[PDB]
């Protein structure tokens, strides 16, 4: 959005030193129990394990492929929530302009709390009036006293929580078959051999499953000076 500042380096990828060292437990943790860093590396390890196995991709369904990469198959419930989330974020630093509100289609006023201050400017052209500010509280269909424009408050609330991308992913995504560490090892040997590492994440991940320091050059990789 225009109100956001510049992408960080982390916005693209995370450093491999932030990979959890207990990979064996990481790949067995349920999604609802994974933190932001743990969830990043669960998806990256599992997603790259399937993508770096070309011979199996054509026989893998889009439902299974999306699960491996950690992408959520969309549906009307989740689409509604995500859309209203992105609309809330956009309105943080953007103007609020849209069609005239009526009983059939009230002006939708997203909010996290139970109230949001709103102003009615009336219709277009000569039907526009001076700003009339009012407090839009949930559970009431508001009508402007001047132009009769109907307003309504929409709350991004779900089960004692507000709506977030993390909440939407946890509520609607279902964990599939438990990730098999044999796949990690098999793909690791595929792209990492004879001092050539073409899957750096899988070389670090396999090292942790082995106990940290087992694979060649990994003790030297983990030895820091400050």
């Amino acid at each position: 959005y225009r109100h956001w500042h510049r992408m960080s380096e982390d916005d693209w990828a995370l450093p491999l030193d932030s990979m959890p060292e207990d990979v064996k437990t990481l790949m067995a943790t349920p999604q609802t129990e994974r933190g932001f860093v743990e969830d990043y590396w669960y998806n990256r390890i599992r997603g790259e394990a399937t993508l770096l196995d070309p011979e199996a991709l054509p026989s893998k369904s889009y439902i299974a492929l999306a699960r491996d990469m950690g992408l959520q198959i969309v549906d009307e419930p989740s689409s509604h929530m995500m859309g209203l989330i992105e609309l809330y974020e956009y309105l943080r630093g953007a103007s609020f302009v849209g069609p005239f509100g009526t009983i059939e289609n009230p002006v939708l006023v997203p909010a996290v709390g139970q109230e949001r201050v709103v102003a009615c400017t009336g219709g277009v052209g000569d039907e526009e009036h001076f700003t009339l500010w009012f407090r839009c509280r949930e559970g009431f269909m508001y009508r402007c006293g001047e132009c009769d424009q109907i307003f309504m408050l929409v709350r991004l609330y779900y089960e004692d929580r507000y709506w977030t991308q993390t909440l939407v992913r946890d509520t609607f995504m279902s964990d599939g078959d438990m990730f098999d560490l044999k796949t990690l090892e098999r793909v690791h040997k595929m792209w990492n051999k004879d001092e050539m590492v073409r899957w750096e994440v899988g070389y670090w991940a396999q090292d942790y499953v082995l106990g940290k320091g087992v694979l060649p050059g990994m003790v030297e990789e983990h030895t820091r000076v400050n």
Binding site: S8, E9, L14, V225
Partner: protein, 186 residues
Amino acid sequence: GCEAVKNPLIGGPNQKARGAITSGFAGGGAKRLGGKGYGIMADWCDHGYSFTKGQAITGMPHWPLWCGGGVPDKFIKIDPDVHFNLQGYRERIGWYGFFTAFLQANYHAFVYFVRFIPINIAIFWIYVNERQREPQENVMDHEEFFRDFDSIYLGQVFDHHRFAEWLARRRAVKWGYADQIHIPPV
């Protein structure tokens, strides 16, 4: 008071039990000295580039802004749980620790003064070096000047070395040290 003050350390175990964090150094993770690491890695000592050794001690700062990002947990040394929670911190650090913390809180101001003072010393040297010297003869008699206007007003441009010598002899006469100095011949 606390163990941390008694035995200052940077990034050890049992930080919470030790009771305080005495080092403002943040970051690390470099594989070599002076190498690319995480965090900003700033301190009063043992950081940056060593002039005497001509070697890098820590790498360039990794800012927590767009140009960089967060620090991996493996290399975090200032735990906010212990860094904050200042309840009764004065008892943990003692009076000398309080003095140390105050002095260490002004590293930014110290960094500035180290960069600002040198030029000002140079400017002051200009003043001191000039103040020692006798004043030049700014003015002479109004009448005598106009009776020899051309020589005085234009002597410098025509021959500056002889004009300089003439000025010196007049200074020696105006301050009564003519018989105590030998003015070099031109």
